[PDB]
Every structure is written in structure tokens, then in C-alpha cells.
Amino acid sequence: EATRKHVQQLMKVFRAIDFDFTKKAFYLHRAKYGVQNQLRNPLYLKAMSLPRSAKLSQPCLNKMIDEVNDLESTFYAGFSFNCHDHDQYSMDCLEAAEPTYLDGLKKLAASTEQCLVQ
Amino acid sequence: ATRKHVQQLMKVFRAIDFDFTKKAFYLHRAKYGVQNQLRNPLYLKAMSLPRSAKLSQPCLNKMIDEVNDLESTFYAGFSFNCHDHDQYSMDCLEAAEPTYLDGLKKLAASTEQCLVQK
């Protein structure tokens, strides 16, 4: 029996939902590699060029972690429900929210560098 | 020479990595939620329709919107609306996921009553 037209229309709606989940997984991937590139890697540089007798400020690592969380929450809000004038999870929402997030991690990597030793 | 500070920084960035993996596991659970409670039942419902049956597009749109609202609410329950446990734990997951599954199975039934345009 030929594939019913309405089966194809039903599956069309579910394709777009599956793709919605894909777009969300792309968001996560960008957010993770944002952290690696703007934050982890430059701070790995600072750590290796340090005197054997240096103590690390864990209040500073604590501020960084919670500041990672707030930047990432704000990135997901920009990608999703807080996208000022775009479809739900578009690439156009990412284009607006990602630079803010990466510039946030960049600034955070600088202030973390400054409080790292003590 | 200074293996100590580097290992100490990796510990913090290891955890952020795993946090991203917990968020990806959430997303897979939400995906297989839609497949099991919504997609698979609605496909059976459709193959039992008369072959001529035409679908109601407004019904399908109500279904996509409600999937996003339900998943928006699941993720909130996974994070900032958890309160009683830490921000992306399995505990937060296990508390909010039945409500999400229950909501999808409800939407599987409300969509069935409107699926055919008669």
C-alpha cells in the first residue's frame, strides 16, 4: 500500500522536533567549547607559568565557577525564550547571544587570572 | 615543574565538562521522552485512520508549541526551579521527569482528539 499522505505530514512535524533537539545540542556544544577556548586554555597558560611556591585562591575558583554558570544561563536565555525578535532556536538567535557569552568568558578569564594566586 | 597548579585547575574544568555532559544526558532523556510518549503513540493512531484522512494543521501546531513549553518546564525543573538539590543533578532530573512524561502523554491524547480534521 502506498504511503499515506497524512503519515508523511505527521512525520514532517516530528522531523522538525527532532531537529529542534539537534539545535539545542548544537547550543550545548558551542557553550562547552566557549568555556574551553576563552577560559580554560588561557588559564592553563597562567597556571604553568607560576612559581613552585604559589598558593591558589579557591575563593577565586569559586567565583569563576558560579560566574561560568550565570554566563551560560544567560546564553541559553538569549538562544531561547529571550530572543528579542526571531524564531525559537534559530541560528540568528545564536548570532546575537554567543558573542556576548564569549566576551563574558573572556573578561572572566582576565579577572580570574588576577585573583588566581594567594 | 609545576604539575600541581595545573592538576588543580583541571579538577575544576573537568567538573564543568561533566556538567555539560549532564546537560546533554538531560537533552537525550527529553528527546526519548517525546519519541516514547508522543511520537510512537501518534504514529499508531495515524495508521488506524481511514486512508483518505486529512490532518488538521492547527492541531499539529498546538502539539509543537506544547512540546516546547513542556520541555522548557522540564529543563527549569532540572536547573533553577529545582531548589531542593544541586543545579543539574540526577535528583533534580528524577523529580521533574515524571511530570514531563505525564504532560507528554496528556498531549498525546489531546492531539488524538484533534488530529483528524472532520
Taking Cα atoms as reference points, which of B43, B44, B34, B28 lies closest to residue B101? B34
Phi first, then psi: give them for residue A91, nearest 5 degrees: -65, -25
User: For residue B16, is it within any domain?
Assistant: no
Stated in angstroms to one decimal place, the resolution of this structure is 2.3
State whether B27 and A17 contact (CB < 8 Å).
no
* Of residues A7, A17, A50, nearest to B34 (C-beta): A17
Q: Which residues contact B115 (CB under 8 A, 6 or more apart)?
A: B42, B45, B46, B49, B55, B56, B59
3-class secondary structure, A116:
coil
Q: What is the DSSP string of A68-118?
A: HHHHHHHHHHHHTTT-TTS-TT-HHHHHHHHHHHHHHHHHHHHHHHHHSB-
Q: How far apart are CA A9 and CA B54, in angstroms?
A: 9
Q: Which residues contact B78 (CB under 8 A, 6 or more apart)?
A: B26, B88, B92, B93, B96
User: In residues, how long is chain A?
Assistant: 118
Q: Are B59 and B111 in contact (CB under 8 A)?
A: yes
Q: How far apart are CA A100 and CA A76, in angstroms?
A: 12
Hey, is the C-beta of A8 within 8 angstroms of any chain B C-beta? no
Hey, is the C-beta of B11 within 8 angstroms of any chain A C-beta? no
State whether B6 and A44 contact (CB < 8 Å).
yes
Identity of residue A54: A
Q: How far apart are CA A68 and CA A62, in angstroms?
A: 10
Q: In whole angstroms, what separates CA A19 from the centre of its chain?
A: 19
Q: Which residues contact A14 (CB under 8 A, 6 or more apart)?
A: B34, B39
Taking Cα atoms as reference points, which of B101, B105, B96 lies closest to residue B74? B96
Q: How far apart are CA B72 and CA B76, in angstroms?
A: 6
Hey, is the C-beta of A25 within 8 angstroms of any chain B C-beta? yes
Q: Name the closest residue on chain A to residue B1, using Cα atoms.
A: A52
Q: Which residues contact B75 (CB under 8 A, 6 or more apart)?
A: B26, B30
Q: How far apart are CA A76 and CA A101, in angstroms?
A: 10
Strand partners, A55: none
Q: How many CB pairs under 8 A join A and B?
A: 89
Taking Cα atoms as reference points, which of B111, B101, B47, B56 lies closest to residue B74? B101
Q: Are B45 and B112 in contact (CB under 8 A)?
A: yes
State whether A13 and B63 contact (CB < 8 Å).
yes
Q: How far apart are CA B70 and CA B61, in angstroms?
A: 14
Hey, is the C-beta of B107 within 8 angstroms of any chain A C-beta? no
Q: How were these coordinates obtained?
A: X-ray
Q: Which residues contact B101 (CB under 8 A, 6 or more apart)?
A: B33, B37
Which single residue is written with the C-alpha cell 532556536?
Answer: A89
Gaps after which residues in chain A, C–N over 2.5 Å? none
Taking Cα atoms as reference points, which of B42, B59, B43, B38 lies closest to residue B117? B59
User: For residue B18, is it within any domain?
Assistant: no
Where residue A54 falls (left for φ over 0; alpha for ψ -120 to 50; beta otherwise) is beta
User: For residue B15, is it within any domain?
Assistant: no
Hey, is the C-beta of A83 within 8 angstroms of any chain B C-beta? no
State whether B20 and A31 contact (CB < 8 Å).
yes
Q: How far apart are CA A32 and CA A68, in angstroms?
A: 11
Angle between helices B3-33 and B57-78 (to 10 degrees): 150
Sign of the C-alpha dihedral computed for residues B70, B73, B77 and B78 taken in this order: positive
Q: Are B54 and A6 in contact (CB under 8 A)?
A: yes
User: For residue B57, is it within any domain?
Assistant: yes
Phi first, then psi: give them for residue B55, nearest 5 degrees: -90, 150
Q: How far apart are CA A104 and CA A74, in angstroms?
A: 10
User: For residue B9, is it within any domain?
Assistant: no
Instruction: Kindly list the residues from chain A whose CB atom is less than 8 angstroms away from the CB atom of residue B39.
Output: 14
Q: Name the closest residue on chain A to residue B58, using Cα atoms.
A: A13
Strand partners, B55: B116
Taking Cα atoms as reference points, which of B78, B45, B75, B73 lies closest to residue B60? B45
Q: How far apart are CA A22 and CA A49, in angstroms?
A: 40
Taking Cα atoms as reference points, which of A23, A22, A17, A28 lies closest to residue A73? A28
Please count the structural domains in chain A. Answer: 1
Structural domain including A106 reads: 5-115
Nearest CA distance, B11 vs chain A (angstrom): 11
